[PDB]
Design a binder for this molecule. Structure first.
Ligand SMILES: Cn1c(N2CCS(=O)(=O)CC2)cc(OCc2cc(F)c(Oc3ccc(Cl)c(C(F)(F)F)c3)c(F)c2)nc1=O
Length: 369
């Protein structure tokens, strides 16, 4: 696997939590500082249906699903699966929202680095039919059996795109909020039976959250999810939008976001009509920051940027001109500086305060647009 280990001093564990078991319940992947660093064995894409899901998203035949599955079906990402949570400290919490065509496990590079710097991360799987695929259970006994019910991406007609994308970003914000509630409630002793039978005991999460230091982060569609979630839920104290796709937002959200907001853009994805929505969020009484990662493409924020070689990567637009490790470090470090400054963290992340300003050879302050 070429998915980067986290650059931070904590060891990183991973597990999955679904609660309740239904289609309206919460599904998320957890990355967290783990007690021991025994084995980086987490299955990156853990079900065949996601490869089928991806193929349907990409426009590909029925065979490409099996091809992708053959290429990546056993690839790991460097986190200790179900490793005990590192005790003795409350950690700041991040809720992460995946982009269109993605699902909870495709942003592990981002998540693992955050976790290795002291964060618990909850990457939610959206059930708005924006994920290539996702599942839930029809009743308790199905959950007990692992008898899954799969939900696949919804292709939209042009007539639909305005209404349905806005309905989806609303649902998405509600799922970020629901997920946050699940964690906060586990943090304060709510007994939960995970709908997945995993070794990780959710009891460990009791009193492990620093409840004042919460952020929502999100890529593309997830970028828009960030802005919508902020406007609804003041439990999120800041937001970080990775190359947001602003189209889903109604004009009412811009006036309603008090919390700090950080836009991190790829150089090659942005276009004026999208950027102008980002500038709408700007007000003298608010903190908004924007940097552009030089020579990066849209997919630089997702794990598939580390899934192929240089040439194939460029061909598929999984990779930009910039090295994918240099990109995602600049994005993780800028973020860490932003999270420290606005969550009030007592760590050394402010050593990358310059990166919030785009003060790097590989950063454009603001936007080229
Ligand atoms: C709104 N949006 C996106 N777009 C809006 C601008 S557009 O030009 O009109 C269309 C794209 C892309 C995206 O990407 C998230 C994402 C999707 C995937 F399918 C991913 O997985 C991929 C992505 C690409 C590829 Cl080629 C493959 C592979 F199977 F072929 F390897 C897998 C992924 F990592 C992230 N998430 C988004 O939310």
């Amino acid at each position: 696997t070429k998915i980067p280990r986290g650059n931070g001093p904590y060891s990183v564990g991973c597990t999955d939590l679904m609660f309740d078991h239904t289609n309206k319940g919460t599904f998320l992947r957890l990355y967290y500082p783990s007690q021991d660093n025994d084995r980086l064995d987490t299955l990156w894409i853990p079900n065949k249906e996601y490869f089928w899901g991806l193929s349907k998203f990409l426009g590909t035949h029925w065979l490409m699903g099996n091809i992708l599955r053959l290429l990546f079906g056993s690839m790991t990402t460097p986190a200790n699966w179900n490793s005990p949570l590192r005790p003795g400290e409350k950690y700041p919490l991040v809720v992460f929202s995946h982009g269109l065509g993605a699902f909870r496990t495709l942003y592990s590079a981002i998540g693992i680095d955050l976790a290795s710097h002291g964060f618990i991360v909850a990457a939610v799987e959206h059930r708005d039919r924006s994920a290539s695929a996702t599942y839930y259970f029809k009743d308790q006994s199905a959950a007990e059996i692992g008898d899954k019910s799969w939900l696949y991406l919804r292709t939209l007609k042009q007539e639909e795109e305005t209404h349905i994308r806005n309905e989806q970003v609303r649902q998405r914000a509600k799922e970020c909020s629901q997920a946050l509630s699940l964690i906060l409630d586990i943090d304060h002793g709510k007994p939960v039976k995970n709908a997945l039978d995993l070794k990780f005991d959710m009891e460990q999460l009791k009193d492990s959250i620093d409840r004042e230091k919460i952020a929502v982060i999100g890529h593309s569609f997830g970028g828009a999810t960030v802005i919508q979630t902020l406007s609804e839920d003041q439990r999120f104290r800041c937001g970080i939008a990775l190359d947001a796709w602003m189209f889903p937002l109604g004009d009412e959200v811009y006036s309603r976001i008090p919390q700090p907001l950080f836009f991190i853009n790829s150089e090659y994805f942005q276009y004026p009509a999208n950027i102008i929505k980002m500038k709408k969020c700007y007000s003298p009484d608010k903190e908004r920051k924007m940097i552009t990662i030089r020579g990066s493409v849209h997919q630089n924020f997702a794990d598939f940027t580390f899934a192929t070689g240089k040439i194939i990567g460029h061909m598929l637009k999984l990779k930009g001109d910039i090295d994918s490790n240099v990109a995602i470090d600049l994005s993780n470090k800028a973020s860490l500086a932003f999270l420290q400054k606005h969550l009030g963290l007592h760590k050394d992340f402010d050593q990358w305060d310059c990166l919030i300003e785009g003060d790097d050879e590989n950063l454009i302050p603001g936007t080229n647009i």
